[PDB]
C-alpha cells in the first residue's frame, strides 16, 4: 500500500503556471525515482519529465525542454515540479508513475489518476 497522488491542475490562461507535488508514504521514496506523463486526446502517455536521483538532473521531454523543471526533496519524500509558461500545446492529462527498479529501466507498476493541464 505505497500509492501515489498528484495534486494541482485546473484552468489557467496563457502565461500563467501551476505546480504539481507527487508525494509518497509508506516506503523509502527518497532513494526511489518518479516520472511524469502526458495523455492528450488520442495521444497516449507522452513523456513529460524524469526525476533521476539526488545526484542527477531531469531529462526534459521533446518540446518542454527549458520550461518544465523537476525538483525533488528527499526529507519530504516527494518529487516536485515548477512548471512555467503554459501554452495550449500542454493541454492534456498528466499522470504519476514510479520506477520499479534501481537501475532506472523505466518499469512502472503504480500510476496516477488524473490532473488536467491546459
Footprint of another protein (CB under 8 A): 35, 37, 44-45, 47, 50, 55-57, 59-62, 65, 97, 99, 101, 103-108
Closest CA to 68 of 13, 117, 24: 117
CB under 8 Å to 54, separation ≥6 — which residues?
30, 72, 74
Shortest distance, position 45 Cβ to another protein, whole Å: 4
Q: Following DSSP, what letter does each residue of 66-115 receive, concatenated?
A: TT-EEE--TTTTEEEEE--S--GGG-EEEEEEEESSSS----EEEE----
| Residue 100 Cβ vs another protein, minimum distance, rounded to whole Å | 9
Min CB(63)–another protein separation in Å: 9
If the CB atoms of residues 50 and 86 are measured against another protein, the closer one turns out to be 50
Amino acid at each position: 500500500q505505497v500509492q501515489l497522488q498528484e495534486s494541482g491542475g485546473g484552468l489557467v490562461q496563457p502565461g500563467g503556471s501551476l505546480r504539481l507535488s507527487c508525494a509518497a508514504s509508506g516506503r523509502t521514496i527518497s532513494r526511489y525515482a518518479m516520472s511524469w506523463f502526458r495523455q492528450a486526446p488520442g495521444k497516449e502517455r507522452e513523456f513529460v519529465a524524469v526525476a533521476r536521483r539526488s545526484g542527477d538532473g531531469a531529462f526534459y521531454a521533446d518540446s518542454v525542454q527549458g520550461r518544465f523543471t523537476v525538483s525533488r526533496d528527499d526529507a519530504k519524500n516527494t518529487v516536485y515540479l515548477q512548471m512555467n509558461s503554459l501554452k495550449p500545446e500542454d493541454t492534456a492529462v498528466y499522470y504519476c508513475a514510479i520506477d520499479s527498479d534501481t537501475f532506472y529501466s523505466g518499469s512502472y507498476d503504480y500510476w496516477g489518476q488524473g490532473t488536467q493541464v491546459t
